[PDB]
Paper text:
The kink turn (k-turn) is a structural motif found in most functional RNA species, including the ribosome (1), spliceosome (2), several riboswitches and box C/D (8) and H/ACA (9) small nucleolar ribonucleoprotein species. k-turns introduce a tight kink into the axis of double-stranded RNA sections, with an included angle of ∼50°, and frequently mediate tertiary interactions in larger RNA molecules, exemplified by the SAM-I riboswitch. In addition, most k-turns are binding sites for specific proteins. L7Ae is a member of a widespread structurally conserved family of proteins that bind k-turns, important in the assembly of the ribosome, the box C/D and H/ACA nucleoproteins and the spliceosome. Kt-23 RNA of T. solenopsae is an unusual k-turn in that an adenine is in place of the normal guanine at the 2n position, thus creating a potential A•A pair at the 2b•2n position.
The RNA used in crystallization experiments comprised an 11-bp duplex in the center of which was the T. solenopsae Kt-23 sequence. The duplex section terminated with a 10-nt loop that is the binding site for the U1A protein. The RNA was co-crystallized with a mixture of Archeoglobus fulgidus L7Ae and human U1A proteins. There are two complexes present in the asymmetric unit, each of which contains one fully base-paired RNA duplex bound by L7Ae in the center and a dimer of U1A of which one monomer is bound at the terminal loop. As in the other complexes, L7Ae binds in the continuous major groove that forms the outer face of the Kt-23 k-turn. Two main regions of the protein interact with the RNA. These are the hydrophobic loop comprising residues 86–93 that envelops the L2 and L1 nucleobases, capping the NC and C helices, respectively, and a basic α-helix comprising residues 27–41. Despite the presence of the rare A•A pair at the 2b•2n position, the T. solenopsae Kt-23 structure adopts conventional k-turn conformation in most respects and superimposes with that of Kt-7 (22) with a root-mean-square deviation = 0.63 Å. The bond from −1n O2′ is accepted by A2b N3 (O–N = 2.7 Å), and thus the structure falls into the N3 class of k-turn structures. In common with N3 k-turn structures with a standard A2b•G2n base pair, the rotational setting of the A2b nucleobase allows a single hydrogen bond to form, from A2b N6 to A2n N3 (N–N = 3 Å). The structure of Kt-23 in the complex contrasts with that found when inserted into the SAM-I riboswitch, where it is an N1 structure lacking a hydrogen bond between A2b and A2n.
Numbering used by the authors:
A (entry chain C): 3 to 117
B (entry chain A): 6 to 101
C (entry chain B): 7 to 101
Write the structure that this text describes.
RNA sequence: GAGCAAGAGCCAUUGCACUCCGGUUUGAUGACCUC
């Protein structure tokens, strides 16, 4: 984990996930997300902070940085699992299309660019 | 045991999803005359069974006679007439 | 000449392919394992199919039993597929 | 292992409907499926 993220910023990003499933396209789970990034389809990825073992998502920051993809941390992976609409935990996700919620996502990106 | 426009079928394969079940039933049974509807549920009380609503009783009879014990999804159909008229049939009669 | 695969024609052409595959399965699973089911995609070749079982006996029982069965209200013509005509069909888009 | 990306087991029920009603374990830390 590279930087700290305030709670409200997360909660916002999760709301934005659940919403963006309605108009955009989401890739859920770490293998799909890594693939999405490698193919440069990733608009922004989500990483959970309670992944055990950490080696599962540990390569996402480096890989996003190499492909110029913004990325945000969220506390719980059960939360992330709920946010993407599945019946199990989720460790990492990625928005690869949004349409409706462009400016919202946009605004979140610079907030992440803070640190 | 008294002839009805509707045949009641059971001993069906409970693993088959509902829409598929309706369409497969309609294949094997549209054979016998016009079908007004096919009714399927997978609730506790209604699983494994189906109702096929023929427009004509003759159709019903030939279906029942011709398909009795037929291995549908590898599992022998038990067919018998429905105990009472399906609502659409009653409406047609017209009682209801 | 007996095969583990039967060829069917006089199928009903106003039936979409997924439903067709499933219904075919519904009526043929009773004779044994089915490796695959292919329906025609061309227009030549408009109402045709291959059902590929695993065992030749399966295909033989199926052929005897279902000859002329009025599937979607049209009695099937069923025969043994010629050797490799199914994989050759799948390799092209004839299907 | 590669590909795919959300279902897959078990227990119970043989049950006559036309608005709808069992339980349980597992699966994005990757199920059925393809090679
Ligand atoms: O959608 P899939 O996982 O059944 O291929």
């Amino acid at each position: 984990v590279r930087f700290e993220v305030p709670e409200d910023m997360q909660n916002e990003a999760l709301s934005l996930l659940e919403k963006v499933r309605e108009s955009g396209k989401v890739k859920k789970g770490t293998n799909e997300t890594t693939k999405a990034v490698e193919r440069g389809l990733a608009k922004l990825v989500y990483i959970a902070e309670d992944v055990d073992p950490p080696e599962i998502v540990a390569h996402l920051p480096l890989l996003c940085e190499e492909k110029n993809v913004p990325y945000i941390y969220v506390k719980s992976k059960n939360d992330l699992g709920r946010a993407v609409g599945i019946e199990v935990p989720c460790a990492s996700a990625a928005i690869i299309n949004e349409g409706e919620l462009r400016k919202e996502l946009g605004s979140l990106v610079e907030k992440i660019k803070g640190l | 045991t008294r002839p009805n426009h509707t045949i009641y079928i059971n001993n069906l394969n409970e693993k088959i999803k509902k829409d598929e079940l309706k369409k497969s039933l309609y294949a094997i049974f549209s054979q016998f005359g016009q079908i007004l509807d096919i009714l399927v549920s997978r609730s506790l009380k209604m699983r494994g069974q189906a109702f096929v609503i023929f427009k004509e009783v003759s159709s019903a009879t030939n279906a029942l006679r011709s398909m009795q014990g037929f291995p549908f999804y590898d599992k022998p159909m038990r067919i018998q007439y429905a105990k009472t008229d399906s609502d659409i049939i009653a409406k047609m009669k017209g009682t209801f």
